[PDB]
Amino acid sequence: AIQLLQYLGALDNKEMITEDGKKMSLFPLSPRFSKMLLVSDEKACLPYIVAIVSALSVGDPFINEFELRSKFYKSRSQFSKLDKFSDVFRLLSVVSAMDYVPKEQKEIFMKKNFLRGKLMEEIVKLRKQLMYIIKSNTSVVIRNEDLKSDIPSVIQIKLLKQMICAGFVDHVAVRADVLFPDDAKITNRTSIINIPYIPVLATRTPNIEDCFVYIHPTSILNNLGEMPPKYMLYYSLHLGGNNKTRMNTLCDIASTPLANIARKGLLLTYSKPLTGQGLKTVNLSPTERYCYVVPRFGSDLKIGWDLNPIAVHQKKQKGQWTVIKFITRKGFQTITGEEKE
């Protein structure tokens, strides 16, 4: 519990409450979901994060296939349209879609889409309470009009993945073939449901297969039709009937954003500067430089892995090189040119 709070930034390395830690305690949610709401301030993403947070806080309003065909998939097709790699955006699709349903037809909508009636109503109620606490404490009457929100932009969707990853920085899983191609040999015939993954910070066993984690049958990825993303966010792990761990996916995250978010957490370390053609440690001064480094993600008893190299600005502070800011490929190339002129 302390470790999870520290990763979220709630507690410092000495186990005192941070300003963020105090700030999360004001909300009625778990520390993970608060952190999602904490970072939502950018680009009017707050309505989407509130809906996602309320949905996860209350439980899944979706009815599973086991508990129950064309109609079922038809409703699933409608709500997965926002993103093909996110369970979270499937939840957001339903909750925000309900907002445009007039009150009289709400019951027909919930039955038509195999949606648990009770949970969504509490999700509606809990959305108002969240929007109330934020408006009241940021400056308060909230109408049903306030919950009506339009579709996210493509820029927003990428950001939501980053905010979601903020609260679940400790539940990122990487495809096993990336780390140990010998042990996890993936073929084009292999079912998506059988592709192994390895959670971060997983306790190493003598046999690596003991740490493998597979996609849950319920995830939209099982119907994806192509190879799954390199990294995946998962909410919880369930022991399937075949003694196989199944993971409830949240949404996919790219390497460079993942390093960006973990930079503020204790889950990222930087290698030595890289060398070679293209990759050259540009030295502005004896104390500051521009270079490429390989971020290592994860905490040597666990499973950590290296991310794609990212151009960084380093400064020498008290004898140690500290990464100040990340740099785009164009930004580094222009920098390499500038010292040449």
Partner 1 sequence: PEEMRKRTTEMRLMRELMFREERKARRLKKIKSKTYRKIKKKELMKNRELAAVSSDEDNEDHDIARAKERMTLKHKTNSKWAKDMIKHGMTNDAETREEMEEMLRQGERLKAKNPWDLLLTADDSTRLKIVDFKQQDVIAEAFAGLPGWGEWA
Partner 2 sequence: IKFESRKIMVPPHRMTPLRNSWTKIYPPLVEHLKLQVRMNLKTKSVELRTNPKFTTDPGALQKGADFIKAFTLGFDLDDSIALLRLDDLYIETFEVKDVKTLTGDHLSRAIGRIAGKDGKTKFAIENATRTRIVLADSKIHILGGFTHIRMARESVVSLILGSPPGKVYGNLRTVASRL
Residues lying near partner 1 in the complex (CB under 8 A) are found at 23, 26, 37-42, 46, 79, 93, 96-97, 99-101, 134, 137-138, 150-151, 155, 158-159, 162-163, 166, 254, 256-257, 260-261, 264, 274, 276-279, 283, 285-286, 292, 294, 308-311, 326, 329
Q: Which is nearer to partner 2, 225 or 286 (CB)?
A: 286
Binding to RNA (CB under 7 A) within 153-192 occurs at 188-189
Q: From the CB of 39, what's the least distance to partner 1, in Å?
A: 6
| Nearest residue (CB) to partner 1, 73 versus 100 | 100
- 14 binds partner 2, rule: CB under 8 A: no
HSE-CB of 185 using CA atoms within 13 angstroms: 2
146 vs 135: CA distance, rounded Å: 11
Q: Which range of residues in 115-123, 244-252, 315-323, 329-337 is near partner 2 by CB under 8 A?
A: 315-323
In whole angstroms, give the CA distance from residue 190 to residue 248: 20
Give the one entry of RNA, partner 1, partner 2, none that residue 318 binds, where binding means its C-beta sits below a cut-off of 5 to 8 angstroms depending on kind.
partner 2
**Residue carrying the six token digits 């084009």:** 188
Phi, psi of 10 (to 5 degrees): -65, -45
Q: Which is nearer to partner 1, 213 or 253 (CB)?
A: 253
Nearest-angstrom CA–CA distance, 173 and 42: 26
Identify the CA nearest to 289 among candidates 300, 299, 279: 279
Whichever of 206 and 319 has its CB closer to partner 2, that residue is: 319
Provide the 10 A C-beta neighbour count for residue 253: 24
Which does residue 319 bind out of partner 1, RNA, partner 2, none, counting CB within 5 to 8 angstroms by kind?
A: partner 2
- The minimum distance between CB 287 and partner 1, in angstroms, equals 9
Joined together, the tokens standing for residue 66 give 């086991």
Tell me if 159 sits within 8 A of 45, measured CB to CB: yes
* Cβ at position 119, least distance to RNA in Å: 9
| Closer of 276 and 319 to partner 2 (Cβ) | 319
Positive/negative CA dihedral, 246, 252, 257, 261: negative
Q: Out of 318, 330, 340, 341, point to the residue binding partner 2 (CB under 8 A).
A: 318
Exposed, middle or buried by CB within 10 Å (0-12, 13-18, 19+), for 221? Answer: buried
Radius of gyration of the chain (CA): 22
Name which of partner 2, RNA, partner 1, none residue 59 binds, using a CB cut-off of 5 to 8 Å depending on partner kind: RNA
Distance CA 142, CA 129 (A): 9
No. of helices (H) and no. of strands (E), the chain: 12, 12
206 contributes a contact to partner 2 by CB under 8 A: no
The single-letter DSSP state of residue 7 is H
Cα dihedral sign for 4, 164, 175, 59?
positive
By CB under 7 A, is residue 55 in contact with RNA?
no
CA separation for the pair 189, 193 (Å, rounded): 12
Nearer to partner 1, 31 or 309 (CB): 309
CB of 58 to RNA, least distance (A): 6
Q: Which stretch, 66-74, 153-161, 188-196, 316-324, contacts partner 2 (CB under 8 A)?
A: 316-324
The span of 193-201, 242-250, 253-261, 314-322 binding partner 2 (CB under 8 A) equals 314-322
Which residue's CB is nearer to RNA, number 30 or number 299?
30
Structural contact between residues 193 and 247, judged by C-beta atoms closer than 8 angstroms: no
Separation of first and last alpha carbons in the chain: 53
Which residues in this chain contact RNA in the complex, by CB under 7 A?
28-30, 57-59, 188-189
Which residues in this chain contact partner 2 in the complex, by CB under 8 A?
272, 318-320
